[PDB]
């Protein structure tokens, strides 16, 4: 009966890869050997080609996606032979050296095993692989809100954090079999982080803002044919709205508004004076000129929608639909200032495709 | 069969039209009056205090308002009792005067007669009843490109436009009866125009931006317990982005930015400098900063959205169902700086409501 799923989600994958790939004549006798290794064995194993063309088009997929525009081009590391935790580590260090390049940021995924029997082989509980941690008692609030509950959980195992608003989460995952998780530190030396000052203003240094370099997602599933590879995370470069208008932003996360508007010499009191907007543009110049300073990738949300925009002529030449999410494509500041904005997109669901997954602390 | 729909929709209505005024024991009555009234004439009429909460209920039912929390207090002019263009024409005149209220502006609809076999008894032509015209022949671009195709159907009926950036359309419409519609140019006492200056940039008034006081939708159509008025001019006053993010910066608008960066004196150059978004964030405070020193109502949109948010909390303690379009109650600019970014809304379609409808010229 999940044999039934798998077989059906498996003939569409392969038929839509190998035809994309040139290979649609190999797709019988694959499908036939696929086949017989679903009843003989429950399941079936991808080729690395399959593989590697199957998360390029999970992201091709990605509804929410602005950066679509570069889907092929993905760095895909299979890594279904790791065992043990120290691999998985190893692989995840890895991941991280290799994504970030000296800051020339290469888009990348790292495969680990696929659930079996929904079992999964490894889980991380990471939700980036570098992330920061938050805290909160007796209406103290340190570092990144959205960080309280895995940090408590880290915290559960024995790890302890310095308390600084920018304390590095160690990885943590846990293996097969185990009832915990483990965790280990973050070799500083592997993570690039971008002080935030501004191209003008020399008072901005002084809130001692910065930001980590590489946004690794961890804890997404990737659906390919049936199998889902819930342990594999990705990263592209950051697109400097995601830093400046919501990190350190939002209310609910570092909450710099006002902060902001006091080093940029603007008054914070009267809301036709559009303080927030003024200090959210500053800030996001900011962000994307110290990521430039320090030579670490970033895109502005213009150049983006413009590199997207492409995207949707390239899917419309390949005969390829298109599909978006038009809430979470549009930047949050300026958005009407792109094309993005001015029309529609269908939000139905293709596979192959990442998706969200149950938190396994909380 | 049409009587049936008309009979349904005005069941639905009059009972809770009279629920909400407290006035439930007269619904049995009530609807008897109307179901004879529309056995013998096809139709039936409002009472004045049902055609008062309808356009009151359409107001507060209108998805895509982010000013609805002041629903109860409209304004509403019964003007079913016009026969002739003359009358039309000064109530037209009478609305601008009266909503304008010497910018000291007041949320006002003005009810036309209704359809009567889907027969219109009047017929609007304007978008707004204050619009500027707009023109483009032989690549040159003038006024508003918005307004391109009623300024031409304008001149084809003998009006000439001056061709300023900023010409007054005339008032068109279409009496029952009648093949062609008639014009009458505004007299220029009645409309309130507002110079576009900045609180501390002086060269901001180099530009001679401006833009009209009030809002005047003429063009949809209010809807009430089955009866379709389809000429029912209302107005709010305008909330800044509308003008200072859209009408004045669109790139198929007046398209201004450009312009805005160098009054300001900012490079245009590269996209990383978010010269766009510096540029729209003083577009938008010299809109608001020129309202508020004219003495015109204008609203911010921090305000407004904090105005929504008492309206979404007014819906609940009255035990009503929210409905709301997410795309358009996020204002163009820093919209994640507002709650309204942060949740979702049911865009479910409620009557009485206002309503699209096709335009008669083009
Ligand atoms: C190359 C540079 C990239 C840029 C600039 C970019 C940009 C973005 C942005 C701005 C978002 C919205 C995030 C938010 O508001 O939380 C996003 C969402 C997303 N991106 Fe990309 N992206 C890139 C690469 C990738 C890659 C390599 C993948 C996967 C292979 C990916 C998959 C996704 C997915 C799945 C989401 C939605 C996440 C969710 O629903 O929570 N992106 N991207
Ligand atoms: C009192 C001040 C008011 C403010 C500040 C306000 C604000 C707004 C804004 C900003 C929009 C979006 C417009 C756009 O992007 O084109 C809008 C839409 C709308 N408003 Fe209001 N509004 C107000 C009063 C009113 C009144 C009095 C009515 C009717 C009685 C009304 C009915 C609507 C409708 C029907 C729309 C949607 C129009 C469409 O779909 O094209 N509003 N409002
Ligand atoms: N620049 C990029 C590149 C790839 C990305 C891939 C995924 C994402 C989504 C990250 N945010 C998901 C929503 C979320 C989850 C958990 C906490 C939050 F504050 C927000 C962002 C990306 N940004
Ligand atoms: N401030 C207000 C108050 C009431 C309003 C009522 C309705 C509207 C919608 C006006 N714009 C409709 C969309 C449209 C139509 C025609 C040309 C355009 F450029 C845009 C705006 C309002 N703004
Ligand atoms: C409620 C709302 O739809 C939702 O919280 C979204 C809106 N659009 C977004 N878009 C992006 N890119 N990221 C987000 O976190 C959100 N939040
Ligand atoms: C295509 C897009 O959904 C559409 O053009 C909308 C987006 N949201 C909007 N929201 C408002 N308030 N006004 C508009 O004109 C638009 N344009
Ligand atoms: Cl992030
Ligand atoms: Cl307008």
Redesign the interface.
């Given at each position: 009966e999940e044999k039934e799923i798998l077989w059906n989600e498996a003939k569409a994958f392969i038929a839509a890869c190998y035809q994309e790939l040139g290979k649609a004549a190999e797709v019988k006798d694959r499908l036939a050997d696929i086949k017989s290794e679903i009843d003989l064995t429950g399941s079936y194993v991808h080729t690395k080609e399959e593989l590697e063309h199957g998360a390029k088009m999970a992201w091709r997929n990605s509804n929410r996606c602005i950066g679509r525009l570069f889907w092929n081009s993905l760095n895909v590391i299979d890594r279904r032979d790791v065992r043990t935790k120290e691999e998985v580590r190893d692989a995840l260090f890895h991941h991280i050296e290799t994504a970030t390049n000296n800051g020339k940021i290469r888009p990348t995924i790292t495969i680990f095993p696929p659930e079996e029997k929904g079992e999964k082989q490894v889980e991380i509980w990471n939700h980036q692989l570098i992330r920061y941690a938050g805290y909160e008692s007796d209406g103290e609030r340190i570092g990144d809100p959205a960080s309280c509950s895995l940090t408590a959980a880290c915290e559960e195992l024995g790890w302890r954090g310095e308390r600084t608003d920018f304390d590095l989460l160690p990885l943590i995952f846990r293996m097969k079999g185990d009832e915990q998780p483990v965790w280990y530190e973050l070799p500083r030396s592997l993570v690039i982080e971008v002080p935030i000052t501004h191209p003008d203003i020399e008072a901005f240094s002084d809130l001692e803002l910065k930001w980590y370099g590489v946004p690794i997602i961890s804890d997404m599933k990737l659906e390919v044919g049936g199998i889902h590879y819930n342990a594999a995370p990705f990263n592209g470069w950051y697109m400097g709205t995601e830093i400046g208008?919501?990190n350190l932003?939002?209310e609910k996360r570092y909450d710099k508004?006002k902060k902001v508007a006091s080093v940029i010499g603007i008054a914070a009191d009267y809301?036709?004076?559009?303080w927030?907007?003024?200090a959210?543009?500053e800030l996001?110049?900011a962000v994307?000129?110290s990521y430039?300073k320090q030579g670490v990738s970033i895109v502005?949300h213009?150049?983006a929608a413009?590199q997207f925009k492409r995207f949707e002529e390239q899917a419309e030449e390949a005969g390829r639909k298109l599909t978006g999410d038009?809430?979470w494509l549009?930047p949050?500041?300026?958005?009407?200032?792109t094309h993005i904005?001015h029309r529609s997109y269908d939000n139905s669901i293709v596979k192959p495709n990442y998706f969200y997954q149950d938190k396994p602390y909380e």
């Open positions: 208008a919501r932003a939002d508004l809301n036709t004076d559009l927030k907007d003024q959210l543009v996001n110049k994307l000129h430039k502005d213009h150049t413009s038009w809430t549009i949050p500041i300026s958005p009407a200032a904005f």
